[PDB]
Amino acid sequence: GVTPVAVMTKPLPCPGKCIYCPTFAATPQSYTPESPAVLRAKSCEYQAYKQVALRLRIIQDMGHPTDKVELIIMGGTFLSADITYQYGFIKDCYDALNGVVAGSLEEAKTINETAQHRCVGLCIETRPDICGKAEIQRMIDFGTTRVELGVQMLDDDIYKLVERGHRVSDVAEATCLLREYGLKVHYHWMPGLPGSSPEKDLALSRMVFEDPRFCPDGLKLYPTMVVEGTILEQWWKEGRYTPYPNGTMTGLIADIKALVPPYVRISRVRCIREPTLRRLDYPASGGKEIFLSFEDASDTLYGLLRLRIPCASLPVLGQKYGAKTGLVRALHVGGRGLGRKLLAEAECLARDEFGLDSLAILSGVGAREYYRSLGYELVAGYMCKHLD
Amino acid sequence: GVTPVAVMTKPLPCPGKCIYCPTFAATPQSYTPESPAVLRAKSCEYQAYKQVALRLRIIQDMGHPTDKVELIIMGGTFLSADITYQYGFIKDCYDALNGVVAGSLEEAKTINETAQHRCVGLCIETRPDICGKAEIQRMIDFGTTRVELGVQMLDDDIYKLVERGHRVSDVAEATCLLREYGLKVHYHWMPGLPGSSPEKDLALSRMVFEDPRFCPDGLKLYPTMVVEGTILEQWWKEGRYTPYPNGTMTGLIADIKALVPPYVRISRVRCIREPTLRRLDYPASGGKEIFLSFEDASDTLYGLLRLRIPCASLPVLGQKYGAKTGLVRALHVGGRGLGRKLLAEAECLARDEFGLDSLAILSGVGAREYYRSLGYELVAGYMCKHLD
Numbered sequence A, B: 001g002v003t004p005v006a007v008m009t010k011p012l013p014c015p016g017k018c019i020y021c022p023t024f025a026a027t028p029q030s031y032t033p034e035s036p037a038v039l040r041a042k043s044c045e046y047q048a049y050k051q052v053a054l055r056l057r058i059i060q061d062m063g064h065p066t067d068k069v070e071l072i073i074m075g076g077t078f079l080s081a082d083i084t085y086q087y088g089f090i091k092d093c094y095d096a097l098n099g100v101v102a103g104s105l106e107e108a109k110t111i112n113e114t115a116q117h118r119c120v121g122l123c124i125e126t127r128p129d130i131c132g133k134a135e136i137q138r139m140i141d142f143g144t145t146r147v148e149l150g151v152q153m154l155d156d157d158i159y160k161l162v163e164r165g166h167r168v169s170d171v172a173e174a175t176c177l178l179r180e181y182g183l184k185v186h187y188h189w190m191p192g193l194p195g196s197s198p199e200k201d202l203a204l205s206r207m208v209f210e211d212p213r214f215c216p217d218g219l220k221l222y223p224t225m226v227v228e229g230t231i232l233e234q235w236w237k238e239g240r241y242t243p244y245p246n247g248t249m250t251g252l253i254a255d256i257k258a259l260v261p262p263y264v265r266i267s268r269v270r271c272i273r274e275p276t277l278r279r280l281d282y283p284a285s286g287g288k289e290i291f292l293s294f295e296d297a298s299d300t301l302y303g304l305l306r307l308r309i310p311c312a313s314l315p316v317l318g319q320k321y322g323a324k325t326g327l328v329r330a331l332h333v334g335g336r337g338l339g340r341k342l343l344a345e346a347e348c349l350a351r352d353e354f355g356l357d358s359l360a361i362l363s364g365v366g367a368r369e370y371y372r373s374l375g376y377e378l379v380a381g382y383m384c385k386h387l388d
Ligand SMILES: CCNC(=O)CCNC(=O)[C@H](O)C(C)(C)COP(=O)(O)OP(=O)(O)OC[C@H]1O[C@@H](n2cnc3c(N)ncnc32)[C@H](O)[C@@H]1OP(=O)(O)O
Pocket: A001, A002, A068, A118, A120, A121, A329, A330, A331, A332, A333, A334, A335, A336, A337, A338, A339, A340, A341, A366, A367, A368, A369, A370, A371
């Protein structure tokens, strides 16, 4: 029951230095120019406060709730701009949610912990090669809870729809780091990219879900299509690219959804979307991932929890919570008890089965109060508990 | 007294996968379209045999000698094409020099060891990121003796005149490998690139000659200028780039030439171009470089020898020449005795001062016979001697 508030960043230059590169970097929304959010963003001159305020007005006019919100920074190039711009943009978002201006970002965050519109999640689109330790540290300062990597398709010989492009190595290194810091990892997935087949697309889709370097929490399926007035259109006119027949495409995405394991949230534009407690383990980036969930005999999902046994404790946790610290990466229950039941199970598994010294939860600022009522305390952006 | 025979490779696609990239990769000759060799290359449909044959006819018509030749493969993208194309292109070159067709590349090489037109050197333009162990191994099969890296300018934030561009890391890794295999290393150098200053250009030029990761054997100075009908021209029209004033440029290249150490061959488009034996040492890519030379009281250069004490013996030398092997990377004497005198000194320094087990010389095929007359024997493309 979380409402998404998606805003765009201002057009930025290409992160890489190249005279062949375009003036402005390529965004995932370059081939979706008619999305309401994109159209609104342009109308507001890409102002953070103006966008969030306007989007709250639309949601309220529709009669939808706004007490639980997930901010979504769209662009994929956000983390490569001026540091002043990044923090300023985020600070604007929280101010709009709070309805009051603060003196700094951290003040706005702490204010949102108890405001009408809780920011229980904050997602940031970024690219595989723009997602290192430096970039991740900033996302913690923003209160980030989820990341969408512009993977698009998993092969270094398939043309990506952005400038330069990335390597598979960059995807694995970013995915590993994101997990070691307690973040959600979602991949942008778009079959039909130049230099690929319906076979290769589906092949790579099976690999990513049975390859420990990857195995994301969800996919955002972007069916590739020739939007007019774009580079890809030039290739269509020139016969250098031919889209998958409409019937073919609808068939391919269907096969993709079937491959997906149970722990994966398929997003679009078997999958996620009395009950008993279910458990599912799988390796990922060296460590172990534990997918807890509440489901009934009909296999309908009621709530989930993502517990990770990490390889290392990269977080800069306090002196008491030293080494041997586990990470609760997610906890969604779309409201009577399932929450604490799931969190209680994860605590024991970390103490009894893996002998971990404590747990840490990279929660959203608007959800911190929830974990406070269960014995957790804020430490360097994380909600922690000694766990005995 | 070596005659250069410069030929171009066929237009190739961009090594990297990018929809923004151009149709054909960018070459160093894209901003020098009026060079005789470029104009001839287009006229011959970029055929290797046709180019080399025609160039031999021109040189003979001018009355210049052709008994000593250096082949120069121009393009910078050669090593990224079909392996069949690469070996075929090289094999064509040797056939034209020999005046006779052979059954394979190796047969053409061995034939050129004794032909009228000796191929005493073979240079290949390549890019910093297209110069790994795999790429270098092929260049040995071709009989390569020198490499020109498209460094252009040494900063990851300066726009290069090719697509994608490279990092400084790629330049250091390529330079290290090239040295460990006994090759000459020359850098393409062009001040005036978008996003730079006459100050930054000269600053970086001082660094490269006092930084162990670099210190090339020579620079090929490409004064940047706005050739009509090019990307850079678009930037000039759009005021996004302004060239260095003509007077400024001539001044900057002058300051560059003064910085240069004594071991460096400044090429254009203190520097190189009775006598006693001179010695000069300097670190480079972990190992040690020894620059021997014959010069007189007036400091006029008569001949040089480049001896390297490598960190490791990456070459795949025979069983007798095991570890502890030195590399003679160059030996030029622009003809009574200086040659063997220089080579004798290097042999002793390798045996007495550095206790090396043997020496190896990555000579050109047309020069192998020279080293045979001094006790060296061919082994995996190198001319080797046990050295006792
Ligand atoms: C990736 C993590 N994302 C989030 O936590 C934000 C989305 N939140 C949710 O999906 C679910 O509300 C939760 C994960 C918080 C679990 O809530 P659920 O009701 O299913 O289980 P619980 O047994 O813990 O009951 C929730 C209690 O905390 C309250 N609560 C719900 N959300 C919040 C919140 N963000 N902050 C503080 N309190 C909350 C509820 O009001 C309730 O208390 P109440 O009955 O007195 O009103």
